[PDB]
Symmetry: D2
Subunit: 121 residues, 4 copies
């Protein structure tokens, strides 16, 4: 649980996700994107189910990155929603929503959707 | 900004979203859902753009709730992604993803998607 | 059902959706978008459940528009997925995915998601 | 274009997608799901960009299946939105929305989202 999730993760684009899972269900850490208007690390914070079912199911979790740090601001935020799966091939499988700030007129085009799979590599 | 976002919000389902926005970009608070396998408040945490553009654009933000508290655990988590819009009729417009724990064979059906609009008045 | 769905619909952006529902479950018509890189009508095609439950549940449906017509080509396509709800205030509530052609390096940013609500009155 | 898309496709779950692309941008065919409340083939219909950019970009397309056929009805419909990518490893990369009919009270839980990658295998 806590131990399985804590540590470094990499996704299929080469991005780096460093996270600490608290016994209380907290996720905290940093994210570094291999793509987009991003450089160096960004703060992340999220939550995970700290007492998952014991029927073979994954562990639900989610986190957010606002794409502002000391280097740049891309006026956007991404949330990843998914589940942690344990085993020899531990994975965090996610889908994500990236919203950027828009005028109300352009609200219809404010949100991208995609999917990331993270491995300990 | 920080002052605009902090406080109590309500969505179209009758859910209650209570949040404090930090100067650093943090969001912290609690969420109470009017629907689903949920009761009472749940911890939420997230992030918002603490230095948005000044061109009339909204403020990007997101937050997460894991649906476990001292009363219930629905083995699932929702992330809201959207933007805060100031002015007279302040709103937070979001789309969300709800993932629940599944077996690997059932992963394809693990995630719901929807949209919530939050305002300051009941 | 077939009679309820067939005809002209309007969404919250001012777009116009004209559709014919077939007895077999087919949807055929045209879409005119009030926003984006689009002008005039575009062909749409899709499917709906021609034998829905009779328990008060909505009618599932979906359709696709590729944003090429005789005037413009925006190298993109939108799919709407949702349900038709009958009764006095008939609506089609949808969420949509818009994908545009990208290079492989840019695929991660190829798809927008949103929601449209269609009604019969302007 | 037309030739690249037409034919049989398989996704990562083992589902089978048989499609004919028309010169006019039409997609027609059948879908057979390896999972869910589904058996045998279902009608599909969709659209694709019949004159894509020539800058290396993929070909945008989308299609719908309503999960009713002569065998069963699952009171739901899935739309796939994505792009066709040519080459030695031709792929149709998609994201999808599955909506099932619900009461208005339960509308909030009516729609699933996911992703499918199709190959000619
Ligand atoms: Cl069992
Ligand atoms: Cl104004
Ligand atoms: Cl009623
Ligand atoms: Cl160039």
């Amino acid at each position: 649980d806590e131990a399985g999730i804590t540590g470094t993760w990499y996704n299929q684009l080469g991005s780096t996700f460093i996270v600490t899972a608290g016994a209380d269900g907290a996720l905290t850490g940093t994210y570094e994107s291999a793509v987009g208007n991003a450089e160096s690390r960004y703060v992340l914070t999220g939550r995970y189910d700290s007492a998952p079912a014991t029927d073979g199911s994954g562990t639900a979790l989610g986190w957010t990155v606002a794409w502002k740090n000391n280097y740049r601001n891309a006026h956007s935020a991404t949330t990843w929603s998914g589940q942690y799966v344990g085993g020899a091939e531990a994975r965090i499988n996610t889908q994500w929503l990236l919203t950027y700030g828009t005028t109300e007129a352009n609200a219809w085009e404010s949100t991208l959707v995609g999917h990331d799979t993270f491995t300990k590599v």
